[PDB]
Description:
The structure is a homodimer.
Chain A: E1 3-9, H1 16-25, E2 38-46, E3 49-57, H2 68-74, E4 77-83, H3 87-93, H4 96-104, E5 111-116, H5 128-138, E6 142-145, H6 150-165
Parallel strand pairs in A: 1-3, 1-4, 4-5, 5-6
Antiparallel strand pairs in A: 2-3
The complex binds guanosine-5'-triphosphate (2 copies) and magnesium ion (MG) (2 copies).
PDB class: signaling protein
Keywords: G protein, RAS, GTPASE, RAP2, signaling protein
Assembly: dimeric
Amino acid sequence: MREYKVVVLGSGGVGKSALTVQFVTGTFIEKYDPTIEDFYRKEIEVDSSPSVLEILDTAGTEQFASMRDLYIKNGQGFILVYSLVNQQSFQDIKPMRDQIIRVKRYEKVPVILVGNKVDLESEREVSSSEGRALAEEWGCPFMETSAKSKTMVDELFAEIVRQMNYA
Amino acid sequence: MREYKVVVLGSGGVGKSALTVQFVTGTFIEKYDPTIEDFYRKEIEVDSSPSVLEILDTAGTEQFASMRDLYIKNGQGFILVYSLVNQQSFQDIKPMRDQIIRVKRYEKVPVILVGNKVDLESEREVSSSEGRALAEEWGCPFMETSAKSKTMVDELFAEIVRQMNYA
Ligand SMILES: Nc1nc2c(ncn2[C@@H]2O[C@H](COP(=O)(O)OP(=O)(O)OP(=O)(O)O)[C@@H](O)[C@H]2O)c(=O)[nH]1
Ligand SMILES: Nc1nc2c(ncn2[C@@H]2O[C@H](COP(=O)(O)OP(=O)(O)OP(=O)(O)O)[C@@H](O)[C@H]2O)c(=O)[nH]1
Ligand SMILES: [Mg+2]
Ligand SMILES: [Mg+2]
């Protein structure tokens, strides 16, 4: 019920592009192509409401550090992704919300914390309760996902819309 | 039908309530009763699609920036009114759209600029060129109206619906 600008942030290879491409195409990318800066748009029915999601999928590998503030300035909603099989990506996510609040200057920014790659949880490095405790401290929702399933990815994107709708 | 939440903004005595009640009930109100806050609901056919409007008619006297931020938060479309026979009400409207964007956080907010009381044009203090220039700077439609005109009032609410169908 408006245009929704979501920025997906997180370190290299956590599955930011696989999550966005699952949402947009219903396909799973199996190869790893490091992202420069990709924009997607899709219509979605969130609780029957028409919502045009515009998704900025950013670079994680070496990111584009200085520019991240520009991405944050322009974003309305933020999906903070880590890989649950990579402890370091989780650690890398911990300053991200503070950086968002710094750029935006207000505390109630719509964010979701995502632990991705749940289908690889035989090699889990970060437990649900850890992710969930970070999200609780931030006051935002926590989800765990696999970019392999359309269903999990659709609820992710549906939820960020609800968070942006209620701010 | 879809819901359209519309907020009517501007300075004291420009005719916000009179426009709203002409729209809703088809009565022109002559008495000046300063508004605190009132909600109206009304179903209109815009380009033959039924649209239901929930209109928030606001106070114009004794500003209160915080109340205005709440009014804005709940609205998806905005009608900014000045009285063409009151120059100060036109200058008063000029910060208003910027406050709207600030509160909303999204850039392309549906707005129409209205110079009301065109029936009292013998006392016009704000020319059509001026009002039209502010609207061309804002990139929004401009209208001059009279609350005594069912035709102009219905075209005003019809047009805010069209703008909200855009963004
Ligand atoms: N098994 C599995 N692999 C995943 C999943 N999500 C991502 N991958 C794989 O992990 C690799 C990286 O995924 P990308 O989406 O390219 O990672 P990214 O976060 O976009 O990386 P950058 O663009 O470099 O920041 C690819 O080989 C993906 O197939 C998932 O949930 N399950
Ligand atoms: N002649 C004429 N009078 C108008 C018109 N619109 C409003 N008025 C009159 O101007 C006075 C104020 O109108 P309201 O609609 O109450 O003004 P308002 O903007 O709601 O004022 P607040 O609620 O105090 O902010 C009343 O006497 C109205 O009848 C119009 O188009 N023509
Ligand atoms: Mg990528
Ligand atoms: Mg009033």
